[PDB]
Amino acid sequence: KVFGRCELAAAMKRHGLDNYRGYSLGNWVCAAKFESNFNTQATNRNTDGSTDYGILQINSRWWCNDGRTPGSRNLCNIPCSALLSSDITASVNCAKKIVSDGNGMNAWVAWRNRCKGTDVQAWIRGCRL
């Protein structure tokens, strides 16, 4: 599923990401924009042999199991394919663990390079939330 911007904002808010670990909703929407282009089916292989999955590009080395990643830990206890669903529940629950792991949203490299420090409020402009 390719989410609309306000569609994704409303779902992320419903699942408790707005101000989660102190990160405003616009931070999460901006992260998803630049990690996945709002596409739940996005996958991208990393050089270490892991892969990132889903709307928030969650990695198969620490967080989900994809069966082909050396040193896999599966800390979210979920198959990586569950993170590709049109229902973002599993991605949000895993994202909550990731953003709590010590480095905050810097775990998302596109957030750090493209969203951090910017006017992230713009990502929820116009939305009825």
From Swiss-Prot:
Keywords: Allergen, Antimicrobial, Bacteriolytic enzyme, Disulfide bond, Glycosidase, Hydrolase, Secreted, Signal. Its main location: secreted. Substrate binds at D101. In the egg white and polymorphonuclear leukocytes. It is found in: Secreted. It comes from the Eukaryota. GO terms for biological process: cell wall macromolecule catabolic process; defense response to bacterium; defense response to Gram-negative bacterium; defense response to Gram-positive bacterium; killing of cells of another organism. GO terms for molecular function: beta-N-acetylglucosaminidase activity; identical protein binding; lysozyme activity. It catalyses: Hydrolysis of (1->4)-beta-linkages between N-acetylmuramic acid and N-acetyl-D-glucosamine residues in a peptidoglycan and between N-acetyl-D-glucosamine residues in chitodextrins. GO terms for cellular component: cytoplasm; endoplasmic reticulum; extracellular space. Its EC number is 3.2.1.17. InterPro entries: Glyco_hydro_22 (IPR001916), Glyco_hydro_22_CS (IPR019799), Glyco_hydro_22_lys (IPR000974), Lysozyme-like_dom_sf (IPR023346). PROSITE patterns: GLYCOSYL_HYDROL_F22_1 (PS00128), GLYCOSYL_HYDROL_F22_2 (PS51348). The keyword Ribosomal protein does not apply. The active site is at E35, D52. Residues 1-129 form the C-type lysozyme domain. Disulfide bonds join C6-C127, C30-C115, C64-C80, C76-C94. Lysozyme C is capable of both hydrolysis and transglycosylation; it also shows a slight esterase activity. It acts rapidly on both peptide-substituted and unsubstituted peptidoglycan, and slowly on chitin oligosaccharides. Belongs to the glycosyl hydrolase 22 family. Monomer. Lysozymes have primarily a bacteriolytic function; those in tissues and body fluids are associated with the monocyte-macrophage system and enhance the activity of immunoagents. Has bacteriolytic activity against M.luteus. PANTHER family: LYSOZYME C. This is Lysozyme C. It comes from Gallus gallus. The gene is LYZ.
